Amino acid sequence: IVGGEKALAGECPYQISLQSSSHFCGGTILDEYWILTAAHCVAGQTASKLSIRYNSLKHSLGGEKISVAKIFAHEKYDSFKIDNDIALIKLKTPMKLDQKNAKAVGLPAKGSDVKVGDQVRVSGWGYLEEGSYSLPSELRRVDIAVVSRKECNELYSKANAEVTDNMICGGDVANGGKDSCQGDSGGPVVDVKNNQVVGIVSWGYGCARKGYPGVYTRVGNFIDWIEIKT
Amino acid sequence: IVGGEKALAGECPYQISLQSSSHFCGGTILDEYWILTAAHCVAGQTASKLSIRYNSLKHSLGGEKISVAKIFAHEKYDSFKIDNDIALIKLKTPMKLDQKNAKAVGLPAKGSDVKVGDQVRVSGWGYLEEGSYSLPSELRRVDIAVVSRKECNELYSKANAEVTDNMICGGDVANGGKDSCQGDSGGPVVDVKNNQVVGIVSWGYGCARKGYPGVYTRVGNFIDWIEIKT
């Protein structure tokens, strides 16, 4: 997370750390058994080899670790376009929720989107700057403004990339400096007001660059897919 | 502000910049005519040497500038102890409130306090770290944990300083890294949940050093004092 601040106890209770030997991606608690993350995070991984840490502001210490039992990556996931970039994880044993740093987040209405002027909170243990040498140990969080789909799409032409109906953007076009980064991927993007996960940290060009908003998977487009799979 | 993030549109609509040719202190909109700040900001200053900038996330650009007409420094302000460190300012002309970036914040109940477990948001244009001699141009906010009076008192009980009953503390005692700093003085300390200003940025030893938390004036102890003057 770039341009964020350290999360406080109970601020982002839905955040999980997805791990294989150590942290590589974030995830969002949907219930006792089910974690939401990115397809690109779980793509060609073995469930048996992945775990999560929940209930902790530190990725490598505290809370509790659970084995993953199941990986569900979107069937239309395109690794080249990073489209349909969503995955569900099912855990081998339940998380104890309602627990201050362990609490589920809500799902938005089916087919909803964000609009310019919405603010959203993005959290995780990713780099503090594009290309730092280590992950912070403490959870960061950042509030960023949503960027119109059309505008974000137009900015990313310069990089030859499309932003689709399956994606939302957020960040600061003019100045950069707020964003998710490497390690943040599959992490939550939350409407705090309504307590709803609206996005997944997905991709972008570098981190926090001027003109290059972070792109997030638009959760409103997979409400179908999530409720079936669970 | 150290260890914070750029306030977004609408997040800190009660922040003002108090200025003498340029910014040197913060303050909080109580209503159209009234600004709460620190006695140490206004003491031995002439009202009509002073102006505020409201309705901007920038201290030197934007919003509107309004002249000060009156200064009420607390009659028990002790400048050696920085105790009773509260002032009220009345403006020459009213602020247009109920804007995106201009609203009043509320006052806590008479005699209230903060406890361990509470978090408060501190905002302003102060230095982004200790001794970095330049103001950010954009408003920052940080959320800190409350530190008990007792603990804070023991922590300062070592720089020969006393945290009195008229004072509350915030900071990270383990890590430091989150604090107000120079230029942030008189700025608001808010309980975001209830939309109440419970503190005024008062004093500290350095900025964001662990075991030297930021010390704030305890607004709950001046509720009588404020409501009378207005």
Coordinates of C-alpha atoms in Angstrom, one line a residue:
Chain A
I1 CA 0.0 0.0 0.0
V2 CA 1.4 3.4 -1.1
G3 CA 0.5 6.7 0.5
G4 CA -1.5 4.8 3.2
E5 CA -1.1 4.5 7.0
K6 CA -0.9 1.7 9.5
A7 CA -4.3 0.1 10.1
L8 CA -5.6 0.2 13.7
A9 CA -7.0 -2.7 15.7
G10 CA -10.5 -3.4 14.3
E11 CA -10.2 -1.0 11.3
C12 CA -9.8 -3.7 8.6
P13 CA -11.0 -6.9 10.3
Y14 CA -11.8 -8.6 7.0
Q15 CA -8.2 -8.6 5.8
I16 CA -6.4 -12.0 5.5
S17 CA -2.9 -12.9 4.4
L18 CA -2.6 -15.6 1.8
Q19 CA 0.6 -17.6 2.2
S20 CA 2.5 -20.5 0.9
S21 CA 5.4 -20.7 3.3
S22 CA 5.1 -16.9 3.5
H23 CA 2.7 -14.0 2.5
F24 CA 2.3 -13.3 -1.2
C25 CA -1.3 -11.8 -1.6
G26 CA -4.2 -10.5 0.4
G27 CA -7.8 -11.7 0.6
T28 CA -11.0 -10.7 2.2
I29 CA -13.1 -12.7 4.7
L30 CA -16.6 -13.3 3.4
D31 CA -17.6 -15.8 6.1
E32 CA -16.1 -18.5 8.4
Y33 CA -15.1 -20.7 5.5
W34 CA -14.7 -18.4 2.5
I35 CA -12.0 -15.9 1.5
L36 CA -12.2 -13.7 -1.6
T37 CA -9.0 -13.0 -3.6
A38 CA -7.7 -12.6 -7.2
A39 CA -7.6 -15.3 -9.8
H40 CA -4.0 -14.3 -10.6
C41 CA -3.1 -15.0 -6.9
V42 CA -4.3 -18.6 -6.9
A43 CA -3.7 -19.4 -10.6
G44 CA -2.1 -22.9 -10.9
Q45 CA -1.5 -23.1 -7.1
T46 CA -2.3 -26.2 -5.1
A47 CA -4.9 -25.6 -2.4
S48 CA -3.1 -28.0 0.0
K49 CA 0.0 -25.8 -0.2
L50 CA -1.7 -22.5 0.6
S51 CA -2.6 -21.1 4.0
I52 CA -4.1 -17.9 5.4
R53 CA -3.3 -15.8 8.4
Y54 CA -6.3 -14.0 9.8
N55 CA -7.0 -12.1 13.0
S56 CA -3.7 -10.2 12.9
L57 CA -2.4 -6.8 11.8
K58 CA 1.0 -8.6 11.1
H59 CA 1.3 -11.1 8.3
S60 CA 4.0 -13.2 9.8
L61 CA 3.0 -13.2 13.4
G62 CA -0.1 -13.6 15.6
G63 CA -3.8 -14.3 14.9
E64 CA -4.2 -17.9 13.5
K65 CA -3.2 -19.8 10.4
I66 CA -5.6 -22.1 8.5
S67 CA -5.0 -24.5 5.6
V68 CA -6.7 -23.9 2.4
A69 CA -8.9 -26.7 1.2
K70 CA -10.2 -25.4 -2.2
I71 CA -9.3 -22.9 -4.9
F72 CA -12.0 -21.5 -7.2
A73 CA -10.6 -19.3 -9.9
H74 CA -12.9 -17.6 -12.3
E75 CA -13.5 -19.9 -15.4
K76 CA -13.2 -16.9 -17.7
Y77 CA -10.0 -15.6 -16.1
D78 CA -7.7 -14.2 -18.8
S79 CA -4.0 -14.0 -17.6
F80 CA -3.1 -11.7 -20.5
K81 CA -5.8 -9.1 -19.9
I82 CA -6.2 -9.7 -16.2
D83 CA -9.9 -9.7 -16.7
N84 CA -12.3 -11.7 -14.6
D85 CA -9.6 -11.6 -11.9
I86 CA -11.4 -13.1 -9.0
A87 CA -11.1 -16.3 -6.9
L88 CA -12.7 -17.8 -3.9
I89 CA -10.8 -19.9 -1.3
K90 CA -12.5 -22.4 1.0
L91 CA -10.6 -23.1 4.3
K92 CA -10.1 -26.6 5.8
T93 CA -11.4 -25.3 9.2
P94 CA -13.5 -22.3 10.2
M95 CA -12.2 -18.9 11.2
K96 CA -13.5 -17.6 14.5
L97 CA -15.1 -14.4 13.4
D98 CA -16.8 -11.5 15.3
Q99 CA -13.4 -11.0 16.9
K100 CA -12.2 -7.5 16.5
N101 CA -9.5 -8.2 14.0
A102 CA -11.5 -11.0 12.5
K103 CA -14.9 -10.1 11.0
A104 CA -16.6 -10.7 7.6
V105 CA -17.3 -7.9 5.1
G106 CA -20.6 -7.5 3.1
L107 CA -21.1 -8.0 -0.6
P108 CA -22.5 -5.1 -2.8
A109 CA -25.8 -5.5 -4.8
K110 CA -25.6 -7.6 -7.9
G111 CA -24.3 -5.5 -10.8
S112 CA -23.4 -2.4 -8.8
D113 CA -20.4 -0.3 -9.6
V114 CA -18.6 2.6 -8.1
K115 CA -18.9 6.2 -9.5
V116 CA -16.5 9.1 -9.7
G117 CA -16.7 10.8 -6.3
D118 CA -16.9 7.5 -4.3
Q119 CA -14.1 6.9 -1.9
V120 CA -12.9 3.4 -1.0
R121 CA -10.4 1.8 1.4
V122 CA -7.8 -0.6 0.2
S123 CA -5.6 -2.5 2.6
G124 CA -2.8 -5.1 2.8
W125 CA 0.9 -5.9 3.4
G126 CA 2.2 -4.9 0.0
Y127 CA 5.2 -2.7 -0.7
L128 CA 5.1 0.8 0.6
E129 CA 6.5 2.2 -2.7
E130 CA 6.9 0.7 -6.2
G131 CA 9.9 -1.6 -6.0
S132 CA 10.8 -1.6 -2.3
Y133 CA 13.0 -4.4 -1.0
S134 CA 10.6 -5.7 1.7
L135 CA 7.0 -6.1 2.8
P136 CA 6.0 -4.0 5.8
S137 CA 5.2 -6.2 8.7
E138 CA 2.1 -4.2 9.8
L139 CA -1.2 -3.9 7.8
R140 CA -1.5 -0.6 5.8
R141 CA -4.6 1.1 4.6
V142 CA -5.4 3.8 2.1
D143 CA -8.5 5.7 1.0
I144 CA -8.5 6.7 -2.6
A145 CA -11.1 8.2 -4.9
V146 CA -12.7 6.1 -7.6
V147 CA -11.8 7.1 -11.1
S148 CA -14.4 6.9 -13.9
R149 CA -14.2 3.7 -15.9
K150 CA -14.0 5.7 -19.2
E151 CA -11.2 7.9 -18.0
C152 CA -9.2 5.1 -16.5
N153 CA -9.6 3.2 -19.7
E154 CA -8.2 6.2 -21.7
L155 CA -5.2 6.6 -19.4
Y156 CA -4.3 2.9 -19.8
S157 CA -4.2 3.1 -23.6
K158 CA -0.7 4.6 -23.3
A159 CA 0.2 1.2 -21.8
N160 CA -1.7 -0.7 -24.4
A161 CA -4.1 -2.1 -21.8
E162 CA -7.9 -2.2 -21.7
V163 CA -9.9 -1.5 -18.5
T164 CA -13.2 -3.4 -18.9
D165 CA -16.6 -3.5 -17.4
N166 CA -15.1 -6.1 -15.0
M167 CA -12.8 -3.5 -13.5
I168 CA -12.9 -0.3 -11.4
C169 CA -10.2 2.2 -10.9
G170 CA -9.1 4.4 -8.0
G171 CA -6.2 6.6 -7.3
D172 CA -5.0 10.0 -8.1
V173 CA -4.6 10.8 -11.8
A174 CA -2.9 14.2 -11.4
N175 CA -0.5 13.4 -8.6
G176 CA -0.3 9.6 -8.1
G177 CA 1.1 8.6 -4.6
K178 CA -1.9 6.6 -3.4
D179 CA -2.3 3.0 -4.4
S180 CA -2.0 -0.7 -3.9
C181 CA 1.3 -2.4 -4.7
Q182 CA 3.0 -5.7 -5.2
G183 CA 1.9 -8.0 -2.3
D184 CA -1.5 -6.1 -2.1
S185 CA -3.0 -8.3 -4.8
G186 CA -6.4 -10.1 -4.1
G187 CA -6.7 -7.6 -1.2
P188 CA -10.0 -5.8 -0.3
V189 CA -11.3 -2.5 -1.6
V190 CA -14.1 -1.5 0.7
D191 CA -16.9 1.0 0.9
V192 CA -16.5 1.8 4.5
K193 CA -19.9 3.6 4.9
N194 CA -21.8 0.5 3.8
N195 CA -19.1 -2.0 4.9
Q196 CA -19.0 -3.6 1.5
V197 CA -16.2 -5.1 -0.5
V198 CA -16.5 -3.5 -4.0
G199 CA -13.1 -4.3 -5.3
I200 CA -10.1 -6.7 -5.4
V201 CA -6.6 -5.3 -5.8
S202 CA -5.9 -6.6 -9.3
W203 CA -3.2 -4.9 -11.5
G204 CA -1.9 -1.6 -12.6
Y205 CA 1.2 0.0 -14.3
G206 CA 3.8 0.4 -11.6
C207 CA 2.5 1.6 -8.2
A208 CA 1.2 5.1 -7.5
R209 CA 2.3 6.6 -10.8
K210 CA 0.8 9.8 -12.0
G211 CA -1.8 9.0 -14.7
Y212 CA -1.9 5.3 -13.8
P213 CA -4.7 4.5 -11.3
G214 CA -4.8 1.1 -9.6
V215 CA -7.2 -1.3 -11.4
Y216 CA -9.4 -3.5 -9.2
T217 CA -11.7 -6.3 -10.0
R218 CA -15.3 -5.0 -9.9
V219 CA -17.0 -7.2 -7.3
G220 CA -20.4 -6.1 -8.3
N221 CA -20.0 -8.0 -11.6
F222 CA -19.4 -11.4 -9.8
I223 CA -22.2 -11.4 -7.2
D224 CA -23.8 -14.2 -9.2
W225 CA -20.5 -16.2 -9.3
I226 CA -19.7 -15.7 -5.6
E227 CA -23.1 -16.8 -4.3
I228 CA -23.3 -19.9 -6.5
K229 CA -19.7 -21.0 -5.7
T230 CA -20.5 -20.7 -1.9
Chain B
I1 CA 1.4 15.1 10.5
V2 CA 3.7 12.0 10.6
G3 CA 2.6 8.6 9.5
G4 CA -0.7 9.8 8.0
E5 CA -2.2 10.2 4.5
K6 CA -3.6 12.9 2.2
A7 CA -7.1 13.8 3.3
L8 CA -9.7 13.2 0.5
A9 CA -12.5 15.6 -0.5
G10 CA -15.0 15.9 2.4
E11 CA -13.0 13.9 5.0
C12 CA -11.7 16.7 7.2
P13 CA -14.2 19.5 6.3
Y14 CA -13.7 21.2 9.6
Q15 CA -9.9 21.9 9.2
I16 CA -8.8 25.5 8.8
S17 CA -5.4 27.1 8.3
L18 CA -4.6 29.9 10.7
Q19 CA -2.3 32.4 9.0
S20 CA -0.1 35.4 9.7
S21 CA 1.0 36.2 6.1
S22 CA 1.2 32.4 5.8
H23 CA 0.1 29.3 7.6
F24 CA 1.5 28.6 11.1
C25 CA -1.3 26.7 13.0
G26 CA -4.5 24.7 12.4
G27 CA -7.9 25.1 13.9
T28 CA -11.4 23.6 13.8
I29 CA -14.7 25.0 12.6
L30 CA -17.3 25.0 15.4
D31 CA -19.6 27.2 13.3
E32 CA -19.9 30.0 10.8
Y33 CA -18.1 32.6 13.0
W34 CA -16.1 30.4 15.4
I35 CA -12.8 28.5 15.2
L36 CA -11.3 26.4 18.0
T37 CA -7.5 26.4 18.2
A38 CA -4.7 26.4 20.8
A39 CA -4.0 29.3 23.2
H40 CA -0.4 28.8 22.3
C41 CA -1.1 29.7 18.7
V42 CA -2.9 33.0 19.3
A43 CA -1.3 34.2 22.5
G44 CA 0.3 37.7 22.3
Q45 CA -1.1 38.0 18.7
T46 CA -3.4 40.8 17.4
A47 CA -6.7 39.4 16.0
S48 CA -6.5 41.6 12.9
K49 CA -3.1 40.4 12.1
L50 CA -4.7 37.0 11.6
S51 CA -6.8 35.2 8.9
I52 CA -8.0 31.6 8.3
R53 CA -8.3 29.7 5.1
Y54 CA -11.3 27.5 4.9
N55 CA -12.8 25.1 2.4
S56 CA -9.4 24.0 0.8
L57 CA -7.2 21.0 1.2
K58 CA -4.3 23.4 0.5
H59 CA -3.1 25.9 3.0
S60 CA -1.8 28.4 0.5
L61 CA -4.2 28.0 -2.4
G62 CA -8.0 27.7 -2.8
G63 CA -11.0 28.0 -0.6
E64 CA -11.5 31.4 0.9
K65 CA -9.6 33.7 3.3
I66 CA -11.4 35.4 6.1
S67 CA -10.0 37.9 8.6
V68 CA -10.0 37.4 12.3
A69 CA -12.0 39.8 14.5
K70 CA -11.6 38.4 18.0
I71 CA -9.2 36.2 20.0
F72 CA -10.2 34.4 23.2
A73 CA -7.2 32.7 24.8
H74 CA -8.1 30.7 28.0
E75 CA -7.7 32.9 31.1
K76 CA -5.8 30.1 32.9
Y77 CA -3.5 29.4 30.0
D78 CA -0.1 28.4 31.5
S79 CA 2.6 28.8 28.8
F80 CA 5.3 27.2 30.9
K81 CA 3.2 24.0 31.4
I82 CA 1.2 24.4 28.1
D83 CA -1.8 23.7 30.3
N84 CA -5.3 25.0 29.5
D85 CA -4.1 25.3 25.9
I86 CA -7.3 26.3 24.2
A87 CA -8.5 29.5 22.4
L88 CA -11.5 30.6 20.4
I89 CA -11.4 32.8 17.4
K90 CA -14.3 34.8 16.0
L91 CA -14.1 35.7 12.3
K92 CA -14.9 39.1 10.8
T93 CA -17.2 37.6 8.2
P94 CA -19.1 34.2 8.3
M95 CA -17.9 31.0 6.7
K96 CA -20.1 29.5 4.0
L97 CA -20.5 26.1 5.6
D98 CA -22.3 22.8 4.6
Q99 CA -19.8 22.6 1.7
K100 CA -17.8 19.5 0.6
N101 CA -14.7 20.9 2.4
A102 CA -16.4 23.2 4.9
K103 CA -18.6 21.9 7.8
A104 CA -18.5 22.4 11.5
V105 CA -17.6 19.4 13.7
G106 CA -19.6 18.9 17.0
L107 CA -18.5 19.1 20.6
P108 CA -18.3 16.2 23.1
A109 CA -20.3 16.2 26.3
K110 CA -19.2 18.2 29.2
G111 CA -16.4 16.6 31.2
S112 CA -15.9 13.7 28.8
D113 CA -12.6 12.0 28.3
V114 CA -11.1 9.5 25.9
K115 CA -10.0 6.1 27.1
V116 CA -7.5 3.4 26.1
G117 CA -9.0 1.6 23.1
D118 CA -10.3 4.8 21.5
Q119 CA -8.9 6.1 18.2
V120 CA -8.8 9.7 17.2
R121 CA -8.0 11.4 13.8
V122 CA -5.5 14.3 13.8
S123 CA -5.2 16.5 10.7
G124 CA -3.2 19.5 9.5
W125 CA -0.4 20.8 7.2
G126 CA 2.4 20.2 9.8
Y127 CA 5.8 18.7 8.9
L128 CA 5.6 15.1 7.6
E129 CA 8.5 14.2 9.9
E130 CA 10.5 15.7 12.7
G131 CA 12.8 18.5 11.6
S132 CA 12.0 18.4 7.9
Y133 CA 11.7 22.0 7.5
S134 CA 8.8 22.4 5.0
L135 CA 5.0 22.1 5.1
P136 CA 3.1 19.6 2.9
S137 CA 0.9 21.7 0.6
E138 CA -2.0 19.1 1.0
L139 CA -3.9 18.3 4.2
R140 CA -2.9 15.2 6.0
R141 CA -4.8 13.1 8.5
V142 CA -3.6 10.3 10.8
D143 CA -5.6 7.9 13.0
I144 CA -3.9 7.2 16.3
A145 CA -4.7 5.1 19.4
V146 CA -5.3 6.9 22.6
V147 CA -2.7 6.5 25.3
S148 CA -3.9 6.6 28.9
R149 CA -3.2 9.8 30.9
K150 CA -1.3 7.7 33.5
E151 CA 0.9 6.2 30.9
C152 CA 1.5 9.4 29.0
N153 CA 2.3 11.1 32.3
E154 CA 4.9 8.5 33.2
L155 CA 6.3 8.7 29.7
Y156 CA 6.7 12.5 30.0
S157 CA 7.7 12.1 33.7
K158 CA 11.2 11.7 32.3
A159 CA 11.4 14.9 30.2
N160 CA 10.4 16.5 33.5
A161 CA 7.0 17.3 32.0
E162 CA 3.5 16.8 33.4
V163 CA 0.5 15.6 31.4
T164 CA -2.3 17.3 33.4
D165 CA -6.0 16.4 33.7
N166 CA -6.7 19.1 31.0
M167 CA -4.8 17.0 28.5
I168 CA -5.1 13.7 26.5
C169 CA -2.5 11.7 24.6
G170 CA -2.3 9.8 21.4
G171 CA 0.6 7.9 19.7
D172 CA 2.1 4.5 19.3
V173 CA 4.1 3.8 22.4
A174 CA 5.8 0.7 20.9
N175 CA 6.6 2.1 17.5
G176 CA 6.1 5.9 17.3
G177 CA 5.8 7.0 13.6
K178 CA 2.2 8.4 14.0
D179 CA 1.9 11.9 15.4
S180 CA 1.3 15.6 14.9
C181 CA 4.3 17.8 14.3
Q182 CA 5.2 21.5 13.8
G183 CA 2.7 23.5 12.0
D184 CA -0.1 21.2 13.1
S185 CA -0.7 23.1 16.4
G186 CA -4.3 24.0 17.2
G187 CA -5.5 21.5 14.7
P188 CA -8.5 19.2 15.5
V189 CA -8.4 15.7 17.1
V190 CA -11.6 14.0 16.2
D191 CA -13.7 11.1 17.2
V192 CA -14.8 10.2 13.7
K193 CA -17.6 7.9 14.8
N194 CA -19.5 10.7 16.6
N195 CA -18.1 13.6 14.6
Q196 CA -16.7 15.3 17.7
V197 CA -13.5 17.3 18.4
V198 CA -12.2 15.9 21.6
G199 CA -8.7 17.4 21.3
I200 CA -6.5 20.2 20.1
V201 CA -3.0 19.5 19.0
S202 CA -1.0 20.9 21.8
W203 CA 2.6 19.7 22.5
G204 CA 5.0 16.8 22.4
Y205 CA 8.7 16.1 22.6
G206 CA 9.8 15.8 19.0
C207 CA 7.4 14.1 16.6
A208 CA 6.5 10.4 16.4
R209 CA 9.2 9.3 18.8
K210 CA 7.9 6.2 20.6
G211 CA 7.4 6.8 24.3
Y212 CA 6.8 10.5 23.7
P213 CA 3.2 10.5 22.4
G214 CA 1.6 13.7 21.1
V215 CA -0.2 15.7 23.9
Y216 CA -3.6 17.3 23.1
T217 CA -5.8 19.7 25.0
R218 CA -8.7 17.9 26.5
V219 CA -11.7 19.6 24.9
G220 CA -14.2 17.8 27.2
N221 CA -12.8 19.9 30.0
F222 CA -13.6 23.2 28.3
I223 CA -17.2 22.6 27.2
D224 CA -18.5 25.2 29.6
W225 CA -15.8 27.6 28.5
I226 CA -16.5 27.2 24.8
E227 CA -20.3 27.3 25.0
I228 CA -20.2 30.4 27.1
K229 CA -17.9 32.5 24.8
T230 CA -20.0 31.7 21.7

